[model samples]
Target: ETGDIVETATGAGSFTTLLTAAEAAGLVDTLKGDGPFTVFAPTDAAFAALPEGTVEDLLKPENKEKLTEILTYHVVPGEVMSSDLTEGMTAETVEGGALTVTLEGGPKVNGVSISQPDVDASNGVIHVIDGVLMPGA
Candidate 1:
């Protein structure tokens, strides 16, 4: 059965950290809403890989905007599957920045290789990446 991106990711059990971040960023409703989105979803381990206290700092109310920016950076406006991606192609993110897509050595976005691509959702698709992609980094 089809589910929204949040539900799909949550059900997969690999995106708890991502889901929590989205909640902290106040983006749960947006991601659950209509209009297809392509999300380069980072797993729990990816969040753990962040500098110590980074995730905790970002989750604080004082850092909501920053959290939102980083979270939205992982989302594009459409359902872009791996097959739709082209080498050197850049896609603008919901956060108002862009991510470069590369096909060499497997599909990658902004240099993070997609470990799992095309996790379908009712509102969009999710591509599992090994790391959290930061905008303006």
Candidate 2:
């Protein structure tokens, strides 16, 4: 069976902060829509790794645009499964930044290794990463 990306992530219970940020950024609808998005999802712990107050600041209503940019940066336009990834290959994200895939020892996106890959969702696939992929950083 299939499910929406947000629903899939919520069910897994590892992406609470990611889902909250998506909702706060007003991106729930898009994620639930007909997207074959490839999401390099960061876990709750990843968010906690950010500088203190950073997540809180992004969640503020006044920072919606910035939050959206950051959230979208985690998503690519197509369904790129683990098998499709190649070393040094770059994919452009929805936020217009590029993510590099590396396979030195294991699959990685932008240097953060994928702990879990090819999490199936109706709208897309989710690859759990140890850190959030930031754009323009």
**TM-scores for candidates 1 onward, in order:** 0.70, 0.70
Question: Over the stretch 26-58, how does candidate 2's per-residue lDDT look in tens digits?
Answer: 566667666786777667666566647755653
Tens digits of lDDT, candidate 1, 4-120: 665643464666545554544556667766668777766667656674775565445555566565666666787574466556677788878877776667778877777665557
Q: CA lDDT of each candidate?
A: 0.64, 0.64
Model 2 / residue 133 / CA error / Å: 1.6
Worst 10 residues of 1 by lDDT: 1-10
Clashing pairs in 1: none
lDDT over C-alpha atoms for residue 105 of model 1? 73
lDDT, candidate 2, at 10: 40
Task: Name the top lDDT candidate.
Answer: 1
Against the true structure, candidate 1 reaches a TM-score of: 0.70
Clash count, candidate 2: 0
Residue 82, model 1, lDDT: 44
